[PDB]
């Protein structure tokens, strides 16, 4: 009942435009690894856009001015709350069901995370266009934790491969057991093949 979205290779507003709607329809969304969100257009236009957003500080009290969040997860959080009606209390109760994370933290590392094909870079950009990584943009606009989160994600990848090797081993033991068992499950399999599940 909790939707875990991946964040790698998803367009920024194209992902946010459906995260907003699933959140308004009552579905608790946790997007994860907001590092690898990429924005279309090239890096220099996107960095100029974010620096122009940094220029927008309130003249008399920049502490009361617009809080320019530098983390990638909170850039994505602010671009969802642009799309949500966050003044009204249904929009405020909406934003409480979006949970963004830089990298993949241990509540959600050992959980299978979902991919939107309808918001994805290889589907919604033609391949000669050049995109822009939100992680690199956030880093060199002033997010301090690129290298830390990169080493932690490398630590997670070298452990998820240890998990996946065992998963491969269990599937090979299964498909080597099935040929040993095909004499006594010959009639349990045949009623599955006649109903379209094992051929």
């Amino acid at each position: 009942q909790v939707l875990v979205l991946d964040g790698r290779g998803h367009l920024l507003g194209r992902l946010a435009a459906i995260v907003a709607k699933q959140v308004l329809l009552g579905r608790k969304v946790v997007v994860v690894r907001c590092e690898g969100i990429n924005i279309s257009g090239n890096f220099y236009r996107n960095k100029l856009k974010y620096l122009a957003f940094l220029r927008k500080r309130m003249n008399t009290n920049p502490s009361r001015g617009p809080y320019h969040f530098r983390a990638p997860s909170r850039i994505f959080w602010r671009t969802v709350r642009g799309m949500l009606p966050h003044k009204t209390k249904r929009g405020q109760a909406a934003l409480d069901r979006l949970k963004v994370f830089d990298g993949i933290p241990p509540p959600y590392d050992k959980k299978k995370r979902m991919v939107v094909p309808a918001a994805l870079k290889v589907v919604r950009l033609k391949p000669t266009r050049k995109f822009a990584y939100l992680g690199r943009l956030a880093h060199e606009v002033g997010w301090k934790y690129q290298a830390v989160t990169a080493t932690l994600e490398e630590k997670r990848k070298e452990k998820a491969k240890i998990h996946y090797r065992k998963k491969k081993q269990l599937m090979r033991l299964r498909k080597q057991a099935e040929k040993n068992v095909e004499k006594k499950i010959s009639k349990f399999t045949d009623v599955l093949k006649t109903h379209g599940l094992l051929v």
């Binding site: 003249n59 008399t60 009290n61 920049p62 502490s63 830089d102 990298g103 933290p105 934790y145 830390v148 989160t149 932690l152």
Partner: protein, 394 residues
């Protein structure tokens, strides 16, 4: 319309919430960046501002007019008794920052350090760490509190030791010892922690933290000067004599149509007692404290090899509003932030320093120890009575 005559603005906006400092002890906002090549060492220390005096030294800078001449230079005495290490704490780098991991305290910690955990030591019954210190005297706890060192040697990147001043040895009214995390910068994390768990519940002096002619940074809170006006705090121009509603003001706050008053406009509020970091203060001399050697104590911690007296660093009649410095001290170049008898933090420098003034060797040849409670005329009590002669009272 514009300003007719351009002029730079008063004050700095970098220090902008000019409020009373929430802390009394100066806090290190950044320890020097660690590298696994150097041997392990503490990177901060605490001291107490005693007072000011002179120096005469011969300068060796080829190129100035003062090469092989002898300047005088103002210096600051910071009494630094050796600090007792009473714990360690580790830190793990997180994508949200740098979280504390596991604080481990020593077995026996002194009741000048135990004062810190109590807002009222008199009314209390002194019960802190009593159920905690019993873990060090049983095997049910010893295998508990060395397994966490084994986890601190796996998951921590930054190991910061936890020391405190030793206020039994100071001339002050206060007994509540200040305590401080000091980042240990050295080898791997195993070396870094198996260095400090032996320093646990024992001394660390100054001379194995700092050295002579090293530039350091002084952290501390300024001398508080109260709720003061805008010409006293922001140094704006005093309005002329003829003004009706007072002349020690800022005349125009702001323009019409930005319908607020900006955060950059000089206003009247708190002046002083601000936290400040002031870099590149040079150790001229690390003093050696009073110690008793063969019956009579040796006192000459202000004797140079060009003076050959038996005078201490203390002036006649002590440091004014401090007391007498009986401990080993650090003599900084120039003024530092803070009033008398104020706690200061000495931090090793964040910068790398290969400059002709930072690499200068300092060989003093006089230390003024005359009375600061007035125009002092005499260096020491012996020379004073040798010049005066027998008095009526003698």
């Amino acid at each position: 319309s514009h300003r007719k005559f351009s002029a730079p603005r008063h004050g700095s906006l970098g220090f902008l919430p000019r409020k009373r400092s929430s802390r009394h002890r100066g806090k290190v906002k950044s320890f020097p960046k660690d590298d696994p090549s150097k041997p392990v060492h503490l990177t901060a220390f605490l001291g107490y501002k005693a007072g000011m005096t002179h120096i005469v030294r011969e300068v060796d800078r080829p190129g100035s007019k003062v090469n092989k001449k002898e300047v005088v230079e103002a210096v600051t005495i910071v009494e630094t008794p050796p600090m007792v290490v009473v714990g360690i704490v580790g830190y793990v780098e997180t994508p949200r920052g740098l979280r504390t991991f596991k604080t481990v305290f020593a077995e026996h910690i002194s009741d000048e350090c135990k004062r810190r955990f109590y807002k009222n030591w008199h009314k209390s019954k002194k019960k802190a760490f009593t159920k905690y210190c019993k873990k060090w005297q049983d095997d049910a706890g010893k295998r508990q509190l060395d397994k966490d060192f084994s986890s601190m040697k796996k998951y921590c990147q930054v190991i910061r030791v936890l020391a405190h001043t030793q206020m039994r040895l100071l001339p002050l009214r206060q007994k509540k010892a200040h305590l401080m995390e000091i980042q240990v910068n050295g080898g791997t994390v195993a070396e870094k922690l198996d260095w400090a768990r032996e320093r646990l519940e024992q001394q660390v002096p100054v001379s194995q933290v700092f050295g002579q002619d090293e530039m350091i940074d002084v952290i501390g809170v300024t001398k508080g000067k109260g709720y003061k006006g805008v010409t006293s705090r922001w140094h704006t121009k005093k309005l002329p004599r003829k003004t009706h509603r007072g002349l020690r003001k800022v005349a125009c706050i702001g323009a019409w149509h930005p319908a607020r008053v900006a955060f950059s406009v000089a206003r009247a509020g708190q002046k002083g007692y601000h936290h400040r970091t002031e870099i590149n203060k040079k150790i001229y001399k690390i003093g050696q404290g009073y110690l008793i050697k063969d019956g009579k104590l040796i006192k000459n911690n202000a004797s140079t090899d060009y003076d050959l007296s038996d005078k201490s660093i203390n002036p006649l009649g002590g440091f004014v509003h401090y007391g007498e410095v009986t401990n080993d001290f650090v003599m900084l170049k120039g003024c530092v932030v803070g009033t008398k008898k104020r706690v200061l933090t000495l931090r090793k420098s964040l910068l790398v320093q290969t400059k002709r003034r930072a690499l200068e060797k300092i060989d003093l040849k006089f230390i003024d120890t005359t009375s600061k409670f007035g125009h002092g005329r005499f260096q020491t009590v012996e020379e004073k009575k040798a010049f005066m002669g027998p008095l009526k009272k003698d």
